[model samples]
Target: PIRLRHLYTSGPHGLSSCFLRIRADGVVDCARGQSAHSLLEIKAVALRTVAIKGVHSVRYLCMGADGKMQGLLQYSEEDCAFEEEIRPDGYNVYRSEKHRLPVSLSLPLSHFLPMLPMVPEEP
Candidate 1:
């Protein structure tokens, strides 16, 4: 499966610091499998942070079993921002709100990973 470490959640800066460790069992497309697992874990953690504090995004690195860079994900709070007056947003207002819905990621992980540069092949 996938593993996550150093997960910390605050209001907007959700999962600000974390790392992903993945292991793909029985798969030729190891890159694809590992990427999928990493993305899933990221989304899951993001969702949890959102549920608690409306976290907007996350940044993490995905490493293979060999302890090398397989991929990376860095999400931001571009969409989760509010442009309202009283709704100046991020304000606790009544402080009764729980489990806020977070902004969605603009780019697709599947599409981005492939475009990213991987570790150089060993000579």
Candidate 2:
């Protein structure tokens, strides 16, 4: 069996619920909807961590209202970040497709853990 973890963000439509989720086959079919146009971001980590590391493309598509991700955003694996800004210098710049989304959208678990609030060991 393989293990894969993912991080996802919905612009105004933050995750509603996760429907079909299976571990053995690593199948995830979640349903989400957004009433408002919030910056939607999602990061998927598909790798066999315990044994070896390799790259695998995410084939599954998350059904959405507007568009099912047109490969619009660019990402940096090194920094574990992504950028999108639909409109510059505006409140809720992600309302329009013309503008890019926010940057550093999702952080991979490898890097996300270190930055989390620390809990010092009590002596």
Please provide, for model 1 over 19-123, each residue's C-alpha lDDT reduced to its tens digit, 9 standing for 90 to 100. 122224311112222233333222223322221111112323322232222222433233222121122322221111121321212111111111211222211
* lDDT per residue as tens, model 2, 21-66: 2112322223232111111223323321111111122222221222
Question: Model 2: runs farther than 4 Å from truth?
Answer: 1-3, 8-15, 18-29, 32-81, 84-99, 102-123
Every model's TM-score: 0.15, 0.19
Error of 2 at 54 (Å): 13
Task: Report the CA-based lDDT of candidate 2 relative to the real structure.
Answer: 0.23
Runs of candidate 1 exceeding 4 Å displacement: 1-21, 24-39, 43-60, 63-110, 113-123
* Model 2, C-alpha of 45: deviation from truth (Å): 13
lDDT against the true structure, per candidate, is: 0.23, 0.23
